[model samples]
Target: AQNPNCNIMIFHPTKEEFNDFDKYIAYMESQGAHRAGLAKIIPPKEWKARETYDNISEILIATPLQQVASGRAGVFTQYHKKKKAMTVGEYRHLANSKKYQTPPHQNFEDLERKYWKNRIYNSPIYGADISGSLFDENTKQWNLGHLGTIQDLLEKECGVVIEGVNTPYLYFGMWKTTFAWHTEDMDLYSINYLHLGEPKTWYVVPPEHGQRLERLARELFPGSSRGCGAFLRHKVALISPTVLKENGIPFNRITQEAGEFMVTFPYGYHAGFNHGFNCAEAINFATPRWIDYGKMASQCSCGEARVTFSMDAFVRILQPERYDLWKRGQ
Candidate 1:
């Protein structure tokens, strides 16, 4: 019943603080919550869970799982090389049954070796929003739809729902499944909600230290960074905490359980693994403070060519809304 020193900031916000996420974040940032780059929130215990249908089980989709058998991959992890056609129902069955009968677990000693040991099962449904996958109702707590701040800023001010960024994306994870270290699209802040299932362990570096993490990755794996503006964006460079510390980069970690929310700050580099089978949804949202981060991301001096998303129009749209605040400063 003991966990390591994660140093991750955990917030126990009241109902009002939880509802008005903008205020919640401002309050936390004032309390230095931003230093950790990532934080977790404990929703009021009495809150009602999402009213979801059983369609998620019936939906057939192509699921991907990480392979650890190709020998020890310390920092350089192999991407999705294997695929299987399975319904969410079947994947859940396997994940739930892993306690007694594990999958074809590969015993490889490496960066993730401590968790991805022998006979474990992990079939992650990372990005899938098929029918039934979405929750039945829009209580809007964190269904990826109503990110309190998203409604206050993106939808009302911008009048558009940018898929994969503003709009929620569905994720399915089981034991040992992992998400690689990277910032959100357009360097926006992200919020992830675990609708149900087991806890997910997250590791994060301070947003201010994101460049240091990126430099370490590029230095450790020059080839991986050869043509990329941000190598970690590939989600393959998995560095251990010990390595991070050796580089003088601090890491904050936490185990997020069901009905909880995890938030990553703009430019904050993060990655995580699943403790067991779980259903989670996440979306990216930008606030007024993000204007400067948006400006920084627009200048991609690095060789990376892909335009993840544009922030020019978004700035133009938000200028009028923030004019008063900007005026007061002037």
Candidate 2:
């Protein structure tokens, strides 16, 4: 098989990438893995960044939210809506080209340097049985049936606070996500499922793989960084599961949880599902943005600030030790 230019060694669930589950977990453990935080249910503030960039800001090089998502939404949503069909590199490059450039100016050259080897799961269009869904291009719409299980699980596990009262409504689709890499990016909680009938490939790489790949990317792309530099912080890889063979790697034998929804986290390697028929999958993440108060973790109790256990709990429990890097400013 032809090899994809990546710093990390790509592992498939099978030769195809989703044939078994135990082997995949074993593969992760072989790499000195940790549980993906897949089961943890965090607070809303930790993931909601609509008003302002939250902790996620600390990790990402960019955001579409120059203005709030309200009245001025056209600006933000336009890109949100357009990006579903675009790949990360393409999305970032296109976003950088917009007239609404923010501070830390982004140029195509900078973006190219960030993604180093350039990964793919590329388009918003996903395969289904004899059909497909153009998720990237479609407006956010929720048919309650599609997410009932997730909603039920959240309600049962986390309680009514994060309730699933109504059918999933399509949130602003276009401006959902657009970011560059930042080293500080946090871990993510996500789920993907093939709603219809079709085969797809989901490619995954862990942080270990990520770091290794970055090292190689630096050697290959020297002057230009691959992936986002500090901006490409917290990221999770989920590729079009069926897309690998084309990239020169075959993941057909890899184990996977398809058709049925499955959640994973940082420990899980990046995934891509490629298929010839039709399919559908919804991705949910709990990435937060950093606020001004965020810098002063001591005074972060205000509602305006996004909250997480680290603030109300961990940092205090661990004391200065929790923030070894920040404490030493390393």
Candidate 3:
């Protein structure tokens, strides 16, 4: 409700601000509208500094890696174990070296474009579910916070299948390795918690303008569509704040620093670049308000069905059992 023009709002809550859980939930409901919410919440001393995450980074180096280029990371590459073993400083040094140069192009701008586009980053924790698993504070040994537990309860009561929709993904980013412009699957809500990093710059297009921007993108780059709906795939053309402003669309920007949580809304279009090496954890969840959009987004543009969850089944089975008690706040 605050700053209606800005799609993303940064919040800094003192330890005393959310001492009462009811106050926090009330604030979240008012500001976190499922259709257009994008926020970064920084709580006082709630998270540790970058070095505290090194223990998990040691755990990540052992996992297999997949190459991500131009923000599309489906392809697998050779095991560059030494690449993962490098510390943030060492990795930055490697990025500065000639080892990561790009080929020359027809023009200066094109050359610069190709250089950033060709940059690749190693990702080992892309689709991992560390909720109660290793490499997270959620494991039985360290029940660090109640957020994960609350998310699990929401999923369980909603009867939304957790396997596909609610899994946590880890990201280890270096310079220029990116997540291209896109929305979360089936318009689900996502929370990206930055465990440690320099800062991750984010650009967001609100849900109301997401389709309009997609239309403009199609007109400019007709062949960019990958047989799915336009703008549904990875490798988005740059939609900077200036471009959105010229087109009369509201764009929001933020540099997500360490120990902050970036929350994205259903159908919100977001893309970002990592300033340097960083480690982050992101996960998806849905509140009761997300049902309609979830149902619609669960299908592909080609009419193929993608089962985000058994929403229909839940309505028929789980809702009847839980709605009454839930509505009464029992």
Q: Give the Cα lDDT of each candidate.
A: 0.62, 0.29, 0.52
List ranges where model 2 is wrong by over 4 Å: 1-185, 207-209, 221-227, 230-258, 267-269, 285-330
- Relative to the true structure, candidate 2 reaches a TM of 0.31
Candidate 3, superposed: residue stretches over 4 Å from native: 16-26, 32-36, 46-51, 61-165, 230-238, 301-330
Tens digit per residue, CA lDDT, model 1, 209-241: 777787787878777677655556555556666
- Worst 10-residue stretch by lDDT in candidate 1? 298-307
Better of 2 and 3 by lDDT: 3
lDDT per residue for candidate 3 within 1-330, as digits (tens), equals: 544565566666776674653355347657653334577777666534233444543343333233333322221121222233443344434444554322335643453344344444433212122342223443321112334432354465565444322345566665554565677755667778776655677878878777776776665445554544634443435554545666776667667877777778777888766654566777666665566655555223343222234233333333455334323331
- Write candidate 2's Cα lDDT for 11-124 as tens digits: 323333233333443454355332222221111222211232122112221222221121111111111121123332333344344331122316533332222222221222
Best by TM-score: 1
Off by over 4 Å in 1: 1-7, 52-55, 62-73, 82-84, 97-113, 116-143, 148-165, 298-330
lDDT of 1: 0.62
Instruction: Report how far residue 70 has shifted in candidate 2, in Å.
Output: 36
Pairs of colliding residues, candidate 1: 105-119
Can you give the lDDT of residue 193 in candidate 1? 77
